[PDB]
């Protein structure tokens, strides 16, 4: 069901796109889970986190709303759930900048961090 967190995610990304002029191979690092290399696939990211709502109008992580969010990342599968919530409180502490794109991707970073280390890669 992680699987089709995915899928959802590549949907909401594959409408973003046009907006950001972002291209297919910017689709194709999200899926993998690689860091943006171009700033259009930074701005395609805070698309889809601005439509799921882990970040907010304001370009800063939101937290509430737990689970609705978290399984959005991981499926409703309860020990991957579970750590996704605690990525969510370890990665809301950490400092970005004020532009929204950069900032989507300053969490991103921290979402892969975290997920390589507690063993969700």
Same mark, same amino acid.
């Given at each position: 069901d992680?699987?089709?967190?995915? $899928?959802?995610?590549?949907?909401?990304?594959?409408?973003?796109? @046009?907006?950001?002029? $972002?291209?297919?191979? %910017?689709?194709?690092?999200?899926? +993998?889970? *690689? @860091?943006?290399? =171009?700033?259009?696939?930074?701005?395609?990211?805070?698309?889809?986190? +601005?439509?799921?709502?882990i970040?907010?109008?304001?370009?800063?992580?939101? =937290?509430?709303?737990?689970?609705?969010?978290?399984? *959005?990342?991981t499926?409703? %599968? @309860? /020990?991957?759930?579970?750590? $996704?919530?605690?990525?969510? %409180? =370890?990665? $809301?502490?950490?400092?970005? @900048?004020? %532009?929204?794109?950069? /900032?989507?991707?300053?969490?991103? =970073?921290?979402?892969?961090?975290?997920?390589?280390?507690?063993?969700?890669?």
């Open positions: 992680e699987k089709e967190a995915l $899928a959802k995610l590549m949907e909401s990304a594959e409408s973003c796109m @046009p907006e950001v002029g $972002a291209t297919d191979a %910017d689709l194709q690092e999200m899926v +993998k889970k *690689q @860091p943006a290399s =171009t700033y259009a696939g930074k701005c395609l990211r805070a698309c889809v986190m +601005k439509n799921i709502g970040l907010d109008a304001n370009g800063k992580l939101d =937290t509430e709303a737990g689970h609705e969010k978290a399984k *959005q990342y499926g409703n %599968d @309860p /020990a991957k759930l579970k750590i $996704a919530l605690e990525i969510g %409180d =370890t990665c $809301a502490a950490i400092t970005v @900048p004020d %532009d929204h794109c950069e /900032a989507a991707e300053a969490y991103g =970073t921290c979402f892969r961090g975290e997920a390589k280390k507690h063993g969700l890669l």
